[PDB]
Amino acid sequence: PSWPQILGRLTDNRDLARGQAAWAMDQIMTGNARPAQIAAFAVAMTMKAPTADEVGELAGVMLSHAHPLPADTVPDDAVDVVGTGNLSTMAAIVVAAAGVPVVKHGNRAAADTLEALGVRIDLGPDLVARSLAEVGIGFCFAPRFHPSYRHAAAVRREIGVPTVFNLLGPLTNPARPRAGLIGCAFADLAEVMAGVFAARRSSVLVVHGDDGLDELTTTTTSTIWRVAAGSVDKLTFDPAGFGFARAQLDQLAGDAQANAAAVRAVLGGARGPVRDAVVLNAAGAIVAHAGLSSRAEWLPAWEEGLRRASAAIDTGAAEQLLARWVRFGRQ
Amino acid sequence: PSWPQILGRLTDNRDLARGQAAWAMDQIMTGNARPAQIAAFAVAMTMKAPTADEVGELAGVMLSHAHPLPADTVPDDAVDVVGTGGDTVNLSTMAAIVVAAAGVPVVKHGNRAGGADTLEALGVRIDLGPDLVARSLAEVGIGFCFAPRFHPSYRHAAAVRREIGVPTVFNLLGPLTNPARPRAGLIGCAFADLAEVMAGVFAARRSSVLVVHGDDGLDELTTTTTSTIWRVAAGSVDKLTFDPAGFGFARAQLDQLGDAQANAAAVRAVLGGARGPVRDAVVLNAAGAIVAHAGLSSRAEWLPAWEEGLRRASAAIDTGAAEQLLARWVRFGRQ
Ligand SMILES: O=C(O)c1ccccc1Nc1ccc(OCCCCCP(=O)(O)O)cc1C(=O)O
Ligand SMILES: O=C(O)c1ccccc1Nc1ccc(OCCCCCP(=O)(O)O)cc1C(=O)O
């Protein structure tokens, strides 16, 4: 195993042999990888087009180096709501208010919204565990939990272009949720992620908006990879089938203060395209959550998930869970 | 112009816009490119498959950053003999000595790893400044440009090469950035599509060059099989198939063609008159460079040019002129 061997293989457009991706990630996590080698690998793998086995090794090794949460502090039915690259933050809160444990994993952009809302996002494992137990939701700040990734994070900024590493966020949640709604901006890489979750024995909905969104929207149809029990089902999803009005991407589009205001409005009951998108993804995460204890029918599962997501807002539960989340950090 | 744009375009398998490659390389040549950005650029363009225009822009920038030789020290008809590397430093090194001994000025360009290593094993002083390389050309008829000495600004790229350790588009720059700027030569490449790219760059320069690709992976004309030759001259490129058998050369084996000291011994044997596959390959490539040299001042017929090139190359060995030139080369550095 060497960088010449692995990189040479990728630049010949060949899939890696077993363990090679894992070796590369280990060199990164130990700090032995040079920036040039990280970049070469990220770019070469991306242009080659990564496989689930390769992504599974990258995410697997990285996750094993992450700060774990304390033993028995994360429910077995905890879920994630996230995309690879607004709505996922809101959806996470709603799902939590519906009675589903949610544990997110994120970073500040070049998480910011949660800070603008007064949430203390940068907490250690013990307090994230307490947050999950007392508020019903927790947030793992990525730099806090993945410090060994910092050189790769720097590389990713310096090159600026999306690479295979942009798939690692949803696959390296330190709390190791077994369920969730996972959004991917590219159909090619969406199926790859579904394969990784499949091997993990996760129950997730890997979603890809046919408009290029990394989450279920009301702008157009979406492709969903239904992952459960090690199997993947590819489906098409039309929100219109659930009486949702179509919208434009302009409405689902700002700064932290603006995003924070959007959150309070939606949680405050404000109707519109933004709310609809939040309810869709929240429902998706709930349907994924149900996929742990059962394998119910697609339509009626979504009917139930949409009902719970909607009620979580309209009860004031979501708005009040947020308030409790802010009060938690203050005390 | 920025890295996210250029790298974005490349990873999308799109050719760059005019000027972008040059911008990228200059950022690299000025220490303004992060190692990650250098590696990302080199790898991305490699897998995209570089164009002659892109490589030409890279080579143009790198060459403009290089130290020149003094004015009026490099003859107009100086040649280079080199391969971009196999997947053959013994062959090219010997061919260069033979060509010089034939009366054709030769100026080489290489580094330690290796091209320069074999010469050091032979006792040649490789790391000389412009004025001494100039003296070597005039007094010995051959000169060597030590790549780190003449391309100091390439140090950031050179470090990245080592760290990734895989061939990239950058490996094409050597023959295209010879700081003596020979207008002719024999240039080898282990891959056909990259050979065609380099031929395109030499064409744009109006150079007289044979770009060669052994159909067995050799970055030089081989005896083991046929070769493709891009005959570059007068801004145009003829793509030709080449069979040494047509000149009476026996079909050798690749195994018949590793340390610098081992290569150094092979040089002394061949230049000493030892016959075999290696001699044949040396004479072929040397003859090729002489054909290229002829293309500077005339459009000669292909076969007669080669026959004359083979005649002179063989003579340069048989008379002992090649062996003696090496000796003078060594002595020159000792003094
Ligand atoms: O930059 C640092 O120097 C640093 C220092 C201490 C700890 C962490 C540090 N950097 C990071 C480490 C992990 C990370 O994120 C881990 C990858 C998962 C993030 C999810 P994303 O792909 O959506 O951003 C990001 C950074 C960073 O600089 O931003
Ligand atoms: O190797 C160095 O030590 C070096 C130091 C400072 C600046 C540049 C350095 N290396 C190079 C200089 C020019 C170059 O390109 C032109 C010469 C190409 C020589 C190819 P060869 O090794 O097969 O002869 C390549 C390198 C390099 O190490 O990659």
From Swiss-Prot, chain A:
SUPFAM superfamilies referenced in this protein's UniProt entry, alphabetically: Nucleoside phosphorylase/phosphoribosyltransferase catalytic domain, Nucleoside phosphorylase/phosphoribosyltransferase N-terminal domain
Binding site for Mg(2+) 1: 88, 215
Signal sequence, renumbered to the chain: none
One cellular-component annotation, GO: extracellular region
Annotated positions binding 5-phospho-alpha-D-ribose 1-diphosphate: 83, 86-89, 104-110
Cofactor(s), names only, from the UniProt record: Mg(2+)
Amino acids binding Mg(2+) 2: 214-215
Binding site for anthranilate 1: 83, 107
GO biological process: L-tryptophan biosynthetic process
Family the UniProt entry places it in: Belongs to the anthranilate phosphoribosyltransferase family.
Cited NCBIfam families: trpD
Subunit structure: Homodimer.
Matches recorded under PANTHER family: ANTHRANILATE PHOSPHORIBOSYLTRANSFERASE
Protein name in the entry: Anthranilate phosphoribosyltransferase
Native organism: Mycobacterium tuberculosis (strain ATCC 25618 / H37Rv)
